[PDB]
C-alpha cells in the first residue's frame, strides 16, 4: 500500500486550486515518479508542483481561463472580435498570433483541403485554427481547462473540431488523421521521458506531421536554442519519416514532415 503521509502530500497536490484543471492521473503519475527521490513527501509535493507548472501550468493561469471563457463568448456574437484577446491568454497561442497569417500561408497547403487534423497537446491552438478555416481538428491535452474551452467554442461556432483529455506519456493517440500537429511539444515531452518523442513520431497514424520548436530569442541570439533543437530533431527523427520543409515564423521553428 501507500504511506499515509505520502497520500496527504498527494492530496495537497490534488486539491490545489492551481491544479484543479489538470488531468488527475497526470498529477498522480508525476508525483509517484518523484516520490522515491525525496525523504520528505512534502518535498516530493513541491517537486511535483514545479514539474507540473513547467509542463502545463505556466502557459495559462486559473483565472485567465474564466477570462478567456467570457471573451470567447463575446466573439460568437460576431461584434467584439476579442477572439484575438482570448487566444492571447495562453502563452503558446499569443506567441503565434502576430505571425498567424504567415503561419497559415506556409503550413495550410501542407495539411490539405478540409483535412482531419490531430492537434497534440493542443492548448488553445484549435480555436486559432478554427478561426482560420481549419475546423476539423481533434485536440488533446492534459489541461482540461483547454479541452473544455475548445469544445465549448467549437459547438457554438458549428465546427466539427473537438478536444479530449490525453496524457502523451501514457497514450500514443490511435486516431486516424490526414495530419498531426506537434507544436512546441517535443522538448517538454522528452523532458518527461527519454525516447518518448521518437516513440510518438514513429507511431502516429497520420502521413503528414507539423513539428515545431520555440526559438527563445528576444533580440539577441541567446544560447543558440534554435540550432540546438534542429540538431536534436534531426538526430531523433525516425528513419520512416522525412523532413519536407523547414522555416521559422514568429520565434517558432516549423518542420513539415512526411511519412516515407
Annotated binding site for S-adenosyl-L-homocysteine: 96, 141, 167-168, 192
- What grid cell was written down for 160? 466539427
Partner from ligand SAH, a second copy, none contacting 183, C-beta within 5 to 8 A by type:
ligand SAH
Buried-state track 77-114, b at ≥16 Cβ within 10 A, e below 16: eeeeebbbbbbbbbbbbebbeebbeebbeebbebbeee
Q: Which helix (H) or strand (E) holds 165?
A: strand 162-165
What residues numbered 90-109 form the site for ligand SAH, per CB under 6 A? 92-93
∠ CA 19-53-100, rounded to 5° = 105
Residue closer to a second copy by CB (options 147, 197) is: 197
> Binders of ligand SAH: how many residues, by CB under 6 A?
22
What residues numbered 159-178 form the site for ligand SAH, per CB under 6 A? 166-169
What residues numbered 31-90 form the site for ligand SAH, per CB under 6 A? 55-56, 59
Residue closer to ligand SAH by CB (options 49, 143) is: 143
Residue closer to a second copy by CB (options 31, 159) is: 31
List CB contacts of 85: < 8 A, sequence separation 6 or more: 71
What residues numbered 176-195 form the site for ligand SAH, per CB under 6 A? 183-185, 188, 192
Reference 60, options 132, 156, 125, 135; nearest CA is 125
d(CA 165, CA 147): 7
56 and 17 in contact (C-beta within 8 Å)?
no
Annotated binding site: 90-96, 121, 141, 167-168, 192
List CB contacts of 57: < 8 A, sequence separation 6 or more: 18, 19, 22
Annotated binding site for S-adenosyl-L-methionine: 90-96, 121, 141, 167-168, 192
Residue closer to a second copy by CB (options 43, 178) is: 43
Shortest distance in whole angstroms from residue 53 CB to a second copy: 6
Four-CA torsion 101, 107, 110, 243, nearest 10 degrees: 160
Scanning 74-82, 99-107, 137-145, 172-180 for contacts with ligand SAH by CB under 6 A, the matching segment is 137-145
- Assign 210 to helix, strand or coil: strand
Residues that bind a second copy (CB under 8 A): 33, 38, 43, 46-47, 49-51, 53-55, 58, 61, 63, 84, 88, 91, 94-95, 97-98, 186-188, 190-196, 216-224, 228-229, 232, 250-251
Is 168 exposed, middle or buried, given 0-12, 13-18 or 19+ CB atoms closer than 10 A?
buried
What residues numbered 115-134 form the site for ligand SAH, per CB under 6 A? 121-123, 125
* Contacts with ligand SAH, residue ranges (CB under 6 A): 55-56, 59, 92-93, 121-123, 125, 141-143, 146, 166-169, 183-185, 188, 192
Amino acid at each position: 500500500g501507500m504511506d499515509e503521509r505520502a497520500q496527504a502530500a498527494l492530496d495537497a497536490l490534488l486539491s490545489a486550486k492551481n491544479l484543479r484543471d489538470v488531468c488527475p492521473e497526470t498529477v498522480r503519475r508525476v508525483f509517484m515518479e518523484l516520490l522515491p527521490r525525496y525523504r520528505k513527501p512534502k518535498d516530493a509535493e513541491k517537486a511535483a508542483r514545479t514539474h507540473l507548472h513547467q509542463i502545463t501550468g505556466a502557459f495559462m493561469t486559473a483565472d485567465a481561463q474564466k477570462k478567456a471563457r467570457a471573451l470567447l463568448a463575446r466573439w460568437n456574437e460576431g461584434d467584439e472580435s476579442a477572439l484575438a484577446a482570448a487566444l492571447s491568454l495562453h502563452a503558446s497561442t499569443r506567441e503565434r498570433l502576430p505571425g498567424a497569417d504567415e503561419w497559415m500561408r506556409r503550413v495550410s497547403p501542407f495539411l490539405g483541403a478540409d483535412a482531419r487534423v490531430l492537434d497534440l497537446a493542443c492548448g488553445l491552438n484549435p480555436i486559432l485554427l478554427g478561426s482560420m478555416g481549419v475546423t476539423n481538428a481533434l485536440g488533446m491535452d492534459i489541461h482540461l481547462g483547454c479541452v473544455r474551452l475548445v469544445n465549448e467554442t467549437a459547438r457554438a461556432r458549428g465546427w466539427h473540431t473537438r478536444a479530449r483529455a490525453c496524457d502523451l506519456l501514457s497514450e500514443i493517440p490511435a486516431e486516424e488523421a490526414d495530419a498531426a500537429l506537434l507544436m512546441k511539444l517535443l522538448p517538454v515531452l522528452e523532458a518527461q521521458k527519454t525516447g518518448r518523442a521518437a516513440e510518438l513520431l514513429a507511431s502516429l497514424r497520420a502521413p503528414r506531421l507539423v513539428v515545431t520548436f520555440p526559438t527563445r530569442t528576444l533580440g539577441g541570439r541567446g544560447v543558440g536554442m534554435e540550432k540546438h533543437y534542429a540538431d536534436w530533431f534531426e538526430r531523433i527523427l525516425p528513419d520512416t519519416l522525412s523532413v519536407r520543409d523547414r522555416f521559422t515564423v514568429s520565434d517558432e521553428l516549423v518542420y513539415l514532415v512526411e511519412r516515407t
